[PDB]
Amino acid sequence: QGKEVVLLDFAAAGGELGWLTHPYGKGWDLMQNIMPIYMYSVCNVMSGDQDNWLRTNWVYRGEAERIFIELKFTVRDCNSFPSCKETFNLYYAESDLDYGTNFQKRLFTKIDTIAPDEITVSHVKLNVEERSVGPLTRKGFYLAFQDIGACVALLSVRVYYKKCPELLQGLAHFPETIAGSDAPSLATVAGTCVDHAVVPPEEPRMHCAVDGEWLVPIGQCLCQAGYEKVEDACQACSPGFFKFEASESPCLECPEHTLPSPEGATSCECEEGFFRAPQDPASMPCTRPPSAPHYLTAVGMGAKVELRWTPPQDSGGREDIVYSVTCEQCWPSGECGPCEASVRYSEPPHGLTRTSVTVSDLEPHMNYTFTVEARNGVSGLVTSRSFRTASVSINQTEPPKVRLEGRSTSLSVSWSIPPPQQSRVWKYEVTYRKKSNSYNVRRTEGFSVTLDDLAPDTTYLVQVQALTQGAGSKVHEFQTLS
Amino acid sequence: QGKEVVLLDFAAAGGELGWLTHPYGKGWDLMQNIMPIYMYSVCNVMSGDQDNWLRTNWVYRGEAERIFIELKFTVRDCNSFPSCKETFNLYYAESDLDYGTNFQKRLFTKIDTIAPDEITVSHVKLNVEERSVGPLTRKGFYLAFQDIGACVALLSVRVYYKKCPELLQGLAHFPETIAGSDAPSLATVAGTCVDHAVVPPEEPRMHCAVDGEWLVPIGQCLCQAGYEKVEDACQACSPGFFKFEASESPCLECPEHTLPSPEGATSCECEEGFFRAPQDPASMPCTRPPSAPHYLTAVGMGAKVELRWTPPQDSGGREDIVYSVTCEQCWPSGECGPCEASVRYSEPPHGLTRTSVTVSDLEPHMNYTFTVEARNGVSGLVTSRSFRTASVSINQTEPPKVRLEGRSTSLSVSWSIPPPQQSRVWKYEVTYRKKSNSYNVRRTEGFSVTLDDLAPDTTYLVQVQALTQGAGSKVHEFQTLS
Numbered sequence: 028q029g030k031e032v033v034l035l036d037f038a039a040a041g042g043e044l045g046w047l048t049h050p051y052g053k054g055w056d057l058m059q060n061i062m063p064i065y066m067y068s069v070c071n072v073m074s075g076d077q078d079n080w081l082r083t084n085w086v087y088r089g090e091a092e093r094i095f096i097e098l099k100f101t102v103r104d105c106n107s108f109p110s111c112k113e114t115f116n117l118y119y120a121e122s123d124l125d126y127g128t129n130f131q132k133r134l135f136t137k138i139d140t141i142a143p144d145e146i147t148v149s150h151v152k153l154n155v156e157e158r159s160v161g162p163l164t165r166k167g168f169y170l171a172f173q174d175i176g177a178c179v180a181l182l183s184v185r186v187y188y189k190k191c192p193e194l195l196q197g198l199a200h201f202p203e204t205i206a207g208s209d210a211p212s213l214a215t216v217a218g219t220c221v222d223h224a225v226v227p228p229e230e231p232r233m234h235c236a237v238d239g240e241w242l243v244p245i246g247q248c249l250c251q252a253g254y255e256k257v258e259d260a261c262q263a264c265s266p267g268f269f270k271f272e273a274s275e276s277p278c279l280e281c282p283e284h285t286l287p288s289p290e291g292a293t294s295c296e297c298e299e300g301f302f303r304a305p306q307d308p309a310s311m312p313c314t315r316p317p318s319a320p321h322y323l324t325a326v327g328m329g330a331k332v333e334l335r336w337t338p339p340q341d342s343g344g345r346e347d348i349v350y351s352v353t354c355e356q357c358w359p360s361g362e363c364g365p366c367e368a369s370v371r372y373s374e375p376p377h378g379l380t381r382t383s384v385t386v387s388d389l390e391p392h393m394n395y396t397f398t399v400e401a402r403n404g405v406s407g408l409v410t411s412r413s414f415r416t417a418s419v420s421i422n423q424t425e426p427p428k429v430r431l432e433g434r435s436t437s438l439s440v441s442w443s444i445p446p447p448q449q450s451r452v453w454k455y456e457v458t459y460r461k462k463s464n465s466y467n468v469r470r471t472e473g474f475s476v477t478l479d480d481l482a483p484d485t486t487y488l489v490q491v492q493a494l495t496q497g498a499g500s501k502v503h504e505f506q507t508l509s
Numbered sequence: 510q511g512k513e514v515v516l517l518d519f520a521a522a523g524g525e526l527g528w529l530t531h532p533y534g535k536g537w538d539l540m541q542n543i544m545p546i547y548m549y550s551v552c553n554v555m556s557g558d559q560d561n562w563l564r565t566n567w568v569y570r571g572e573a574e575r576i577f578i579e580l581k582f583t584v585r586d587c588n589s590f591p592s593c594k595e596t597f598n599l600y601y602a603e604s605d606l607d608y609g610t611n612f613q614k615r616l617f618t619k620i621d622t623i624a625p626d627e628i629t630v631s632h633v634k635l636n637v638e639e640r641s642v643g644p645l646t647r648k649g650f651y652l653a654f655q656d657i658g659a660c661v662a663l664l665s666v667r668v669y670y671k672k673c674p675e676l677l678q679g680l681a682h683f684p685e686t687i688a689g690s691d692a693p694s695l696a697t698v699a700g701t702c703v704d705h706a707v708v709p710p711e712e713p714r715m716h717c718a719v720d721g722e723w724l725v726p727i728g729q730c731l732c733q734a735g736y737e738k739v740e741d742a743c744q745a746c747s748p749g750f751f752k753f754e755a756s757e758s759p760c761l762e763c764p765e766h767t768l769p770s771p772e773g774a775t776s777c778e779c780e781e782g783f784f785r786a787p788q789d790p791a792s793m794p795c796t797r798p799p800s801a802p803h804y805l806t807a808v809g810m811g812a813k814v815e816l817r818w819t820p821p822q823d824s825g826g827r828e829d830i831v832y833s834v835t836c837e838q839c840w841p842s843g844e845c846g847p848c849e850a851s852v853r854y855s856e857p858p859h860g861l862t863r864t865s866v867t868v869s870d871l872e873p874h875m876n877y878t879f880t881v882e883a884r885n886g887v888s889g890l891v892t893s894r895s896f897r898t899a900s901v902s903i904n905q906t907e908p909p910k911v912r913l914e915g916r917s918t919s920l921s922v923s924w925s926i927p928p929p930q931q932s933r934v935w936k937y938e939v940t941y942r943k944k945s946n947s948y949n950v951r952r953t954e955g956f957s958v959t960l961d962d963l964a965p966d967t968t969y970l971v972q973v974q975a976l977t978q979g980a981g982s983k984v985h986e987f988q989t990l991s
């Protein structure tokens with residue numbers, strides 16, 4: 028149930044309300060019972076022809092469309108005393124002027140015959156009856172009651188109308204609106220967003236019914252950045268909190284490494300020495316550049332150097348860690364300088380996410396120092412650097428990488444060396460022994476030989492040296508067919 | 510108003526319906542008036558103590574919650590014949606079994622006292638009265654009528670209940686639902702998207718009221734790609750039409766240069782020789798590469814060449830037109846070849862949106878042919894080329910560009926030439942005459958001289974030649990102070 032606005036309340040007046048009766052003498056009469064109770068009684072069941080009227084004061088209508096008329100009464104049984112009726116009539120008249128004592132029944136429209144559910148034979152049996160009328164349009168109206176020979180006491184008369192009350196809901200405001208006249212009335216009432224609230228992407232609406240109930244909520248408003256919902260309004264975020272968007276969510280407390288916020292903050296400021304990247308959301312804690320790769324190994328396996336490292340002990344709270352590798356040369360001469368352009372990497376030496384690289388094409392005996400640096404998203408915002416160094420010497424230059432391209436029974440062999448080294452080699456020298464003092468060497472400028480005139484199902488020791496005006500491969504075991 | 514389902518209709522039965530009366534003899538009785546009209550009459554206003562009951566058949570309730578009971582009747586005036594009442598009583602009883610002739614008034618709950626609005630003194634004055642009761646829960650119910658000494662004819666009795674009908678709205682389906690019992694009942698009923706419809710981003714809902722009206726639509730479904738809304742459903746796009754998205758829009762007809770579509774098309778296919786770029790929306794007509802720049806001029810103003818052109822006559826229906834310039838050299842020797850890397854352009858010679866460029870650093874006497882090509886977004890999809898050619902010869906190499914850096918009374922002069930030409934110059938030669946056979950020449954390797962010992966407020970003719978082991982500027986008029 029919603030708002031009732033009362034227009035008339037006979038009982039609530041304690042007798043001081045005085046209504047016109049026609050005729051002046053006979054018919055309805057005000058009665059007091061004493062604890063005073065007042066009432067309007069008529070009981071002329073004997074007289075053969077009655078037409079007794081009771082007319083209320085002029086009632087100002089205001090904004091009311093449908094009025095509700097609530098009556099409380101007793102009726103005595105026509106068979107309970109030895110031309111009688113047990114009902115009365117209820118009328119109304121609209122009008123813009125209050126006519127005072129000038130009352131004319133012909134201007135009154137009949138609402139209904141009022142009958143009792145219970146009848147007395149004197150147990151105080153109080154009937155209740157409600158009717159309604161609408162739409163009304165004039166400035167005011169009158170009610171009336173007609174008795175044609177009933178024995179009635181009329182104890183109460185309430186006229187009220189219904190409203191949908193002023194409403195705060197869904198962070199919007201809805202004005203008090205008058206319940207409409209027709210029963211299938213749902214009036215759509217637009218809402219107003221309370222201060223610091225907004226409709227983001229459905230606009231707030233409510234539907235006012237004839238009983239004054241608000242029925243079906245459509246849409247809502249949301250508290251904007253720096254504000255949240257507290258009860259029915261928007262409030263500034265507490266000190267220590269933030270909110271960056273218009274959402275239906277509370278203020279989030281300040282993330283890690285951040286400076287205590289003032290009221291209505293859309294984001295907390297960064298702590299000294301901590302930062303944010305231009306892609307980081309306000310919800311992300313302040314971060315910093317990482318420490319150095321925790322461990323780094325530089326191992327000279329063969330002619331190439333392998334660098335293997337480990338992520339930093341401290342990431343500075345980030346997950347976008349990359350590595351970059353740089354190099355210095357030093358001749359143990361004493362002189363030093365940056366790495367030559369002839370050094371290659373197994374992977375472009377910057378923007379590394381892998382934790383290892385292979386370095387090739389290195390001058391022998393030279394002391395190479397490799398520095399591997401760790402950087403995350405906030406690194407460009409500090410001057411400082413986090414790195415580890417490791418030094419390697421290499422002895423042999425790149426040997427030929429040799430494989431079998433086929434076999435019979437004979438052994439068909441191929442090899443390769445990186446194209447920068449290919450200028451250095453004068454000739455390749457192939458050696459083959461049987462698996463103690465009798466080997467066979469051949470020479471070529473090319474990259475493949477077939478070893479001929481060999482024993483079936485036999486293990487041979489094959490080596491390929493790169494010769495210069497050098498560096499030789501590992502011994503391979505190659506077996507002939509059967 | 511919505512769906513009424515009738516449960517009982519006395520008048521609509523033409524007498525063949527037969528109701529229990531208590532007592533069997535006295536009281537209510539079926540009467541026929543002849544054009545047959547049937548009715549139930551009691552008129553024992555004389556007898557001192559009446560309690561006459563009329564009980565309907567057992568009525569099966571089905572799914573009904575609130576029933577509506579509509580009566581039509583006459584009542585005669587108790588004063589119209591010389592223990593009388595002018596009302597009757599309406600009761601009901603719920604029950605799961607039909608008890609037949611076994612009728613027990615004590616099981617009947619009173620709905621209301623029924624009174625007439627109009628009373629007869631015989632003009633056929635037919636009162637109408639509606640009441641309702643609910644919620645009901647048992648399998649069926651009975652109505653009854655009680656007369657205590659009224660003279661009533663009862664001509665009609667309709668019990669019905671209300672439903673919200675099965676509904677197609679907003680491209681969703683809503684099941685037939687029973688109107689609820691309570692007046693402030695709005696039952697929310699979810700809808701089902703009809704075939705080929707979808708909820709894109711609010712889900713369809715309707716609200717069923719107690720009178721069987723559907724009240725407030727929330728949400729909708731939309732016809733998906735290849736489909737549109739026709740009446741209350743989704744239909745395949747006509748031949749000749751398309752629709753690419755789920756929207757509330759009709760099928761669009763096929764754009765220009767396109768192949769007639771089959772039913773339910775999401776896009777029309779391209780006409781032979783026409784294309785679409787991988788960024789073009791389905792709504793965009795098929796396009797093609799443009800024609801050549803309509804006009805091109807190649808003019809050798811000085812040492813530089815100016816190319817000015819004009820957009821193509823035919824754009825192939827596009828607005829993303831770019832130009833690119835290329836160059837061939839030919840010595841009038843006869844031999845030809847691509848342009849040297851020493852030729853510069855006033856603007857990177859590809860991706861041009863401008864319709865002109867300046868070409869500088871050109872070898873004298875050489876026949877340069879410039880080709881300017883037009884390309885739009887669909888050009889990469891054809892092999893063909895649209896271009897215009899224009900040829901230019903240049904005579905002089907770049908002269909010094911000379912300006913006054915200051916003056917007195919003297920003239921302080923500076924010049925420049927593009928750094929590629931700066932190697933060629935042995936010395937610069939400055940000549941100055943007074944504005945007929947007496948000039949003064951000086952020489953420098955640098956780019957500025959101050960002319961000294963000059964007359965006040967005087968016009969001088971200054972030229973600067975670039976000398977080689979050449980090319981000289983225009984004559985400038987420089988005036989001293991006063």
Ligand SMILES: *[C@@H]1O[C@H](CO)[C@@H](O)[C@H](O)[C@H]1NC(C)=O
Nearest residue numbers: 355357359363394395396418
């Ligand atoms: C280079 O190698 C030596 C050992 O040969 C090592 O101790 C030294 O620290 C390395 N680099 C530099 C720049 O000190």
Ligand SMILES: *[C@@H]1O[C@H](CO)[C@@H](O)[C@H](O)[C@H]1NC(C)=O
Nearest residue numbers: 837839841845876877878900
């Ligand atoms: C080059 O210039 C001549 C005139 O000197 C012109 O007629 C000729 O068509 C030009 N280019 C070519 C490649 O034919």
Ligand SMILES: [Cl-]
Nearest residue numbers: 042057058059
């Ligand atoms: Cl009094």
Ligand SMILES: [Cl-]
Nearest residue numbers: 159160161162
């Ligand atoms: Cl009304």
Ligand SMILES: [Cl-]
Nearest residue numbers: 453454470471
């Ligand atoms: Cl040799």
Ligand SMILES: [Cl-]
Nearest residue numbers: 524539540541
């Ligand atoms: Cl009959």
Ligand SMILES: [Cl-]
Nearest residue numbers: 641642643644
């Ligand atoms: Cl009820």
Ligand SMILES: [Cl-]
Nearest residue numbers: 935936952953
């Ligand atoms: Cl000289």
Ligand code: NA
Nearest residue numbers: 139140625626
């Ligand atoms: Na009535």
Ligand code: NA
Nearest residue numbers: 143144621622
């Ligand atoms: Na009643």
